[PDB]
Enzyme design. Structure first.
Site, PDB file in Angstrom:
ATOM      1  CG  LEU A   1      -1.990  -1.036   1.326  1.00  0.00           C
ATOM      2  CD1 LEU A   1      -2.651  -1.024   2.705  1.00  0.00           C
ATOM      3  CD2 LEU A   1      -3.011  -0.765   0.225  1.00  0.00           C
ATOM      4  N   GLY A   2       2.162   1.053   0.297  1.00  0.00           N
ATOM      5  CA  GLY A   2       3.056   2.173   0.469  1.00  0.00           C
ATOM      6  C   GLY A   2       4.315   1.786   1.214  1.00  0.00           C
TER       7      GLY A   2
ATOM      8  N   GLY B   1       7.450   3.047   4.058  1.00  0.00           N
ATOM      9  CA  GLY B   1       7.680   3.897   5.206  1.00  0.00           C
ATOM     10  C   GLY B   1       9.064   3.664   5.750  1.00  0.00           C
TER      11      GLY B   1
ATOM     12  CG  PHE C   1      11.664   2.153  10.911  1.00  0.00           C
ATOM     13  CD1 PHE C   1      10.987   3.246  11.392  1.00  0.00           C
ATOM     14  CD2 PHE C   1      13.025   2.084  11.070  1.00  0.00           C
ATOM     15  CE1 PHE C   1      11.654   4.240  12.043  1.00  0.00           C
ATOM     16  CE2 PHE C   1      13.698   3.069  11.725  1.00  0.00           C
ATOM     17  CZ  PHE C   1      13.017   4.156  12.208  1.00  0.00           C
TER      18      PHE C   1
ATOM     19  CD  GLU D   1       7.908  -3.029   0.628  1.00  0.00           C
ATOM     20  OE1 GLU D   1       7.820  -4.255   0.880  1.00  0.00           O
ATOM     21  OE2 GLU D   1       8.216  -2.569  -0.497  1.00  0.00           O
TER      22      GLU D   1
ATOM     23  CG  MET E   1      -6.970   4.605   5.857  1.00  0.00           C
ATOM     24  SD  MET E   1      -8.716   4.962   6.133  1.00  0.00           S
ATOM     25  CE  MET E   1      -8.774   6.737   5.800  1.00  0.00           C
TER      26      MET E   1
ATOM     27  CG  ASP F   1       4.289  14.518  11.281  1.00  0.00           C
ATOM     28  OD1 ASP F   1       4.709  15.501  10.639  1.00  0.00           O
ATOM     29  OD2 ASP F   1       4.634  13.341  11.007  1.00  0.00           O
TER      30      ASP F   1
ATOM     31  CE  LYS G   1       4.295  14.941   7.023  1.00  0.00           C
ATOM     32  NZ  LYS G   1       5.708  14.977   6.614  1.00  0.00           N
TER      33      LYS G   1
ATOM     34  CG  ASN H   1       1.577  12.414   7.961  1.00  0.00           C
ATOM     35  OD1 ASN H   1       2.192  11.641   7.236  1.00  0.00           O
ATOM     36  ND2 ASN H   1       2.152  13.045   8.973  1.00  0.00           N
TER      37      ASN H   1
HETATM   38  N1  LIG Z   1      -3.558   2.555   7.086  1.00  0.00           N
HETATM   39  C1  LIG Z   1      -3.040   2.654   5.839  1.00  0.00           C
HETATM   40  N2  LIG Z   1      -3.760   2.361   4.728  1.00  0.00           N
HETATM   41  C2  LIG Z   1      -3.226   2.480   3.500  1.00  0.00           C
HETATM   42  N3  LIG Z   1      -1.960   2.886   3.253  1.00  0.00           N
HETATM   43  C3  LIG Z   1      -1.137   3.223   4.274  1.00  0.00           C
HETATM   44  C4  LIG Z   1      -1.651   3.122   5.654  1.00  0.00           C
HETATM   45  N4  LIG Z   1      -0.652   3.508   6.478  1.00  0.00           N
HETATM   46  C5  LIG Z   1       0.412   3.820   5.693  1.00  0.00           C
HETATM   47  N5  LIG Z   1       0.128   3.647   4.385  1.00  0.00           N
HETATM   48  C6  LIG Z   1       1.070   3.930   3.278  1.00  0.00           C
HETATM   49  O1  LIG Z   1       2.399   3.630   3.687  1.00  0.00           O
HETATM   50  C7  LIG Z   1       3.175   4.807   3.856  1.00  0.00           C
HETATM   51  C8  LIG Z   1       4.034   4.712   5.113  1.00  0.00           C
HETATM   52  O2  LIG Z   1       3.250   4.605   6.298  1.00  0.00           O
HETATM   53  P1  LIG Z   1       3.548   5.541   7.587  1.00  0.00           P
HETATM   54  O3  LIG Z   1       2.719   5.109   8.777  1.00  0.00           O
HETATM   55  O4  LIG Z   1       3.373   6.975   7.153  1.00  0.00           O
HETATM   56  O5  LIG Z   1       5.098   5.186   7.901  1.00  0.00           O
HETATM   57  P2  LIG Z   1       6.152   6.243   8.517  1.00  0.00           P
HETATM   58  O6  LIG Z   1       5.699   6.563   9.931  1.00  0.00           O
HETATM   59  O7  LIG Z   1       7.452   5.488   8.461  1.00  0.00           O
HETATM   60  O8  LIG Z   1       6.031   7.403   7.563  1.00  0.00           O
HETATM   61  C9  LIG Z   1       2.191   5.962   3.866  1.00  0.00           C
HETATM   62  O9  LIG Z   1       2.763   7.114   3.224  1.00  0.00           O
HETATM   63  C10 LIG Z   1       1.017   5.428   3.073  1.00  0.00           C
HETATM   64  O10 LIG Z   1       1.196   5.653   1.675  1.00  0.00           O
HETATM   65 MG   LIG Z   2       4.637   8.949   6.422  1.00  0.00          MG
END
Ligand SMILES: Nc1ncnc2c1ncn2[C@@H]1O[C@H](COP(=O)(O)OP(=O)(O)O)[C@@H](O)[C@H]1O
Ligand SMILES: [Mg+2]
Ligand SMILES: Nc1ncnc2c1ncn2[C@@H]1O[C@H](COP(=O)(O)OP(=O)(O)O)[C@@H](O)[C@H]1O
Ligand SMILES: [Mg+2]
Ligand SMILES: [Mg+2]
Ligand SMILES: [Mg+2]
Lengths: 486, 486
Positions: free
Chosen positions: B163-164, B166, B168, B170, B237, B284, B286, B289
């Site tokens: 889905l994305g 981050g 640490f 995926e 999401m 945080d 934005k 987020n």
């Molecule tokens: N609950 C979720 N549903 C769908 N995609 C998500 C969700 N949480 C994170 N993602 C995807 O993964 C990415 C990294 O998650 P995130 O919690 O923001 O990690 P970090 O705290 O390392 O930034 C986000 O930018 C988003 O694109």
């Molecule tokens: Mg993020």
């Protein structure tokens, strides 16, 4: 059906059931097989647990087979083996040791899946039952058992017609207000009971009717007391007694056509077997004591003269009964068996066919001393109304010497069911109340002391578990009070 | 939907629930109002007890009124007063003191039957609840609470798409094998987490997402560990983040039409109010987020920079956040409020409308020192894309001095919902997720010691009560496992 009383049947909070959770027999067959409501709640548990699905379904199918018309038996046995006994099928029963499965596979006759059913129940009595005890279904059973123990005495019943008159009071058809179920309420005025020294008789009856559960004995549901009376609420039998039906219906042509008479004999015989199996001696069998219910089925009743043999005791003494029905051994002052009852059975069948007694002529009234001699040494005479079979049966029951009298051998009347007279009687269907009946109807200065009150209290022992659960179920009340989500 | 895993969800024997019958909060509102399953089971009890019928029905009707289209409100209020408030009607509520009935009778606006509902629940929390506790329904709740506490870790979830990405690890869309419910599983590789000193941030997030239950924060369902990862299973999401949607969908015409941007602002504002009500500072907020679900509703996410104010604490210190969103007080090294978050809200609404930041030009990249000065002393400029309302709102959020900044007063954002910008927003319907969204989508040498393992264990705290009960219910599993007689 009274709504005010209906409203008094409401399941209690669990906390109110803690006490009777000790004063209760946990025993498996005692609570899950014999008590209608326990069985219902235990099958529910089973139905909601996948694992047990097969066992429950087998169990249910067997009882279905045991109650099926003979015509449908072969196929029900077919589907049954196909559904639980081929190792393929979904509902295969892996808990059945192969030796048992083998026997069940090769079909005999009546009693076909009996040994199967014993194995199924033996299984359910282990873990499945132990699981039940740890389930909510068991807690529900405790709630019901609590409502069952609540007071339901006189104010709970509405008398509305006299069914008959008896030594110590009348017998009324009455309604149980909550459920609207129809019963018979037998009253025993307290004062007369004392005046005439009738406590032992009254009690022997209440205890017998309470501890015995047969479709051929009238059944006790409740036992309480009023200001004036002791009360026995029991199966209602609205179709008159055999003796009425012998003489009073067909006045100028008194008697029963053999088949009808045989049907009753067969039902009555089943009544005795139950009594004797529980070591009870009736001592008072006779046409006037055998009642018909609305459908034309028959139950024995009136048990003031009965005796219960203490455990280990095989014979007893004591003059008791109706003149013309007491058997030789009893008259000779000897000690006697259940055999006594069979002699009475014989006099009874005889009367049913001949519309007369074996020992005197119409209107002939003799002294006890003389009637005694006839019974002891007079050989019976069988008119033409009798068929070879009838005659022979009566000869076998009326045998003067009990050692030679057809009766009760090896804990049953199987030997007796054998007789050629019962050639056309399907005992299975009879025992299960599923045959079509041959005929369908259409005082001064008494003071009460301590001992009197004690007796009354011991008599008024309240509600009888099995029949009450039956009532709750038949009457719909259990279904209603048992719902989980509406 | 995996049958092998489905089969591991089976209610336990009562004896297994004895222990967690002490380790559980009995509290009424805690178990019967907040826990979906307790509420369901407590309403069931209520439905099957005549006495409580009226109260249950009122309660149910009120929630129905609180969720009705504005068009149907008048009549639902009508039938509601007719059905429970006229002393005539069957379902009259005698437990409601007349003073309460009077107010409920004379209808105001939004919040009409709120004080009625409080009186109903106050009633239910007394005897009715105390009865529930003495009923089977409460024992069922203990069974469910037992299944909920059973281990459901990695082998229970099937990853099937990224889905994305981050810091640490995926984030995967994954399925809960038993129920088939779709979640997002966020992975944090254990080694990197240690290497980069990220334990505090990771934990702050897990605790926030667990103890908070809002339709505008992403929701934590499970928290466990693998050989390699920590895991957070949370609301999925699937519709991308606001920032993607600002620049990447309509490439040559970047931005949101006001209504859409306002809708999000309104949702986001609801997200903050919850956080602030629980004394949490986001720090945080934005576009990147803020996530969209399949319907186009929005939730805030990513909480490693959050802080929880210890009880009694009103302000805090610490540099943390994203350059261009941190508010003046924070930069000035001062101690700050929730106010911080509102400044970020302002930058956010601004970006949603202008497709640019307030503090730099497209592609303009400056040193921290300089960006800081702009935030601190540069007055914002509002192009024509803004409407009087927008502009004014942003001015109120972007106020350099928190003492003068629109935000969070008196335990809420009511003051803020007031603003002319939310003129066309039905807050009731928004807060209940019942509005139609304006847009619908289509490493080397690390060794683990004692402290590392302890951290991991404290992190992997297992299943989250509320969301798990929701899942059981939505997914149909509760209906299935809860049946009494099939
Ligand atoms: N609950 C979720 N549903 C769908 N995609 C998500 C969700 N949480 C994170 N993602 C995807 O993964 C990415 C990294 O998650 P995130 O919690 O923001 O990690 P970090 O705290 O390392 O930034 C986000 O930018 C988003 O694109
Ligand atoms: Mg993020
Ligand atoms: N269970 C019953 N149902 C209907 N009528 C009954 C029932 N029991 C007794 N009766 C009527 O009441 C009469 C007397 O009852 P019974 O118990 O035989 O009294 P007793 O033992 O004092 O002779 C019977 O002859 C019968 O007509
Ligand atoms: Mg009689
Ligand atoms: Mg008698
Ligand atoms: Mg983070």
């Amino acid at each position: 059906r009274d709504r005010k009383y209906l409203a008094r049947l409401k399941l209690p909070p669990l906390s109110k059931c803690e006490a009777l959770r000790e004063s209760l027999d946990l025993g498996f067959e005692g609570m899950c097989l014999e008590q209608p409501i326990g069985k219902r709640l235990f099958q529910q548990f089973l139905r909601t647990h996948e694992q047990h699905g097969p066992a429950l379904q087998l169990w249910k199918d067997i009882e279905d087979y045991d109650t099926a018309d003979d015509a449908l038996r072969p196929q029900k046995a077919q589907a049954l083996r196909a559904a639980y006994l081929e190792p393929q099928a979904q509902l295969f029963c892996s808990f059945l040791d192969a030796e048992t499965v083998a026997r069940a596979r090769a079909g005999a006759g009546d009693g076909l899946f009996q040994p199967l059913l014993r194995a199924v129940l033996a299984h359910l009595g282990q873990a499945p039952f132990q699981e039940f005890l740890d389930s909510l279904y068991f807690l529900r059973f405790l709630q019901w058992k609590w409502l069952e123990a609540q007071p339901m005495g006189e104010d709970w019943f509405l008398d509305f017609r006299v069914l008959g008159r008896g030594g110590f009071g009348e017998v009324f058809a009455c309604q149980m207000k909550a459920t609207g179920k129809l019963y018979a309420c037998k009253k025993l005025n307290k004062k007369r009971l004392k005046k005439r020294k009738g406590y032992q008789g009254a009690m022997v009856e209440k205890k017998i009717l309470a501890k015995v559960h047969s479709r051929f004995i009238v059944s006790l549901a409740y036992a309480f007391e009023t200001k004036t009376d002791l009360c026995l609420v029991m199966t209602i039998m609205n179709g008159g007694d055999i003796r009425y039906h012998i003489y009073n219906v067909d006045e100028d042509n008194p008697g029963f056509q053999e088949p009808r008479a045989i049907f009753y004999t067969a039902q009555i015989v089943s009544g005795l077997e139950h009594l004797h199996q529980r070591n009870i001696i009736y001592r008072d069998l006779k046409p006037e004591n055998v009642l018909l219910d609305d459908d034309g089925n028959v139950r024995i009743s009136d048990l003031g003269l009965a005796v219960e043999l203490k455990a280990g005791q095989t014979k007893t003494k004591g003059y008791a009964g109706t003149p013309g029905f007491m058997a030789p051994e009893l008259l000779l002052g000897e000690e006697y068996d259940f055999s006594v009852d069979y002699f009475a059975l014989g006099v009874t069948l005889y009367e049913m066919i001949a519309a007369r007694g074996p020992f005197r002529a119409r209107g002939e009234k003799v002294e006890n001393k003389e009637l005694k001699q006839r019974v002891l040494e007079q050989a019976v005479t069988y008119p033409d109304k009798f068929s070879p079979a009838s005659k022979d049966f009566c000869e076998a029951l009326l045998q003067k010497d009990p050692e030679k009298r057809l009766g009760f051998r090896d804990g049953s009347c199987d030997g007796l069911r054998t007789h050629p007279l019962f050639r056309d009687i399907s005992w299975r269907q009879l025992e299960a109340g599923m045959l079509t009946p041959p005929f369908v109807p259409d005082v001064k200065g008494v003071a009460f002391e301590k001992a009197d009150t004690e007796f009354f209290q011991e008599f008024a022992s309240g509600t009888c578990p099995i029949p009450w659960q039956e009532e709750m179920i038949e009457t719909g009340v259990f279904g209603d009070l048992n719902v989980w989500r509406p």
